[PDB]
Amino acid sequence: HHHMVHITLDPDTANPWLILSEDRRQVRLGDTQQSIPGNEERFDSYPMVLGAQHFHSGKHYWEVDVTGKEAWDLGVCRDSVRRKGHFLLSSKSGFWTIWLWNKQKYEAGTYPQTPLHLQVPPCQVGIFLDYEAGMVSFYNITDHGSLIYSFSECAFTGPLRPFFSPGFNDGGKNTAPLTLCPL
Numbered sequence: 546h547h548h549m550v551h552i553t554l555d556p557d558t559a560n561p562w563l564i565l566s567e568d569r570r571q572v573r574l575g576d577t578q579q580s581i582p583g584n585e586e587r588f589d590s591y592p593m594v595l596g597a598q599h600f601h602s603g604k605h606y607w608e609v610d611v612t613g614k615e616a617w618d619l620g621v622c623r624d625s626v627r628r629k630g631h632f633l634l635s636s637k638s639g640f641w642t643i644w645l646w647n648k649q650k651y652e653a654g655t656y657p658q659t660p661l662h663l664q665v666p667p668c669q670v671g672i673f674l675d676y677e678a679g680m681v682s683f684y685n686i687t688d689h690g691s692l693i694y695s696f697s698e699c700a701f702t703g704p705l706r707p708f709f710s711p712g713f714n715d716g717g718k719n720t721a722p723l724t725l726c727p728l
């Protein structure tokens with residue numbers, strides 16, 4: 546898509562158990578805790594991180610590689626979302642996301658969450674946002690960009706932020722990073 550965006554991970558929002566590659570295009574769940582200003586932005590309870598980019602308007606496309614991963618979380622969220630404390634990832638909270646959990650279960654963050662039927666387990670996900678349209682949509686790059694799920698009527702007011710999680714590593718076998726694909 547010509548609507549493509551080059552997204553850089555924002556280390557200030559990064560949960561402190563996370564590791565970003567030096568070019569801030571990779572993120573993996575570590576096995577200890579970096580010591581960094583426990584600031585207002587940092588996701589504190591969950592392995593979560595936003596992009597440096599704020600979308601106030603327009604259409605914006607990007608892709609993420611999920612090859613070899615048993616869980617993950619991807620989408621857009623309001624700048625205003627809460628960073629500290631426990632919370633349900635959901636549109637009801639200002640997150641427009643889909644996830645793999647414990648592998649073998651793809652779901653959209655509606656309230657309550659919605660199980661997806663997928664023909665092809667993705668190694669690559671496309672994320673698209675039409676602001677003025679109130680659209681966020683997820684495509685299965687591996688299955689000829691088939692629509693996974695789509696949130697409509699989102700009616701956005703704030704600035705918006707891309708959002709990721711490499712998931713949790715309960716298994717020891719969800720260590721592979723998420724990767725932002727060059728485009």
Ligand SMILES: CNC(=O)[C@H](Cc1ccncc1)NC(=O)[C@@H]1C[C@@H](C2CCCCC2)CN1C(=O)C[C@H](N)c1ccccc1OCCOCCO
Nearest residue numbers: 591592617618631632633634635644646658710711712713
């Ligand atoms: C529908 N119920 C769920 O468990 C969903 C489902 C879900 C799972 C994975 N991916 C997206 C969705 N989780 C959440 O919404 C959040 C996010 C999640 C992360 C996991 C790793 C990747 C990133 C997402 C963990 N999660 C919680 O744990 C909530 C939490 N349980 C809590 C919600 C409210 C109020 C007190 C809450 O917990 C208080 C303490 O309970 C822990 C028990 O000791």
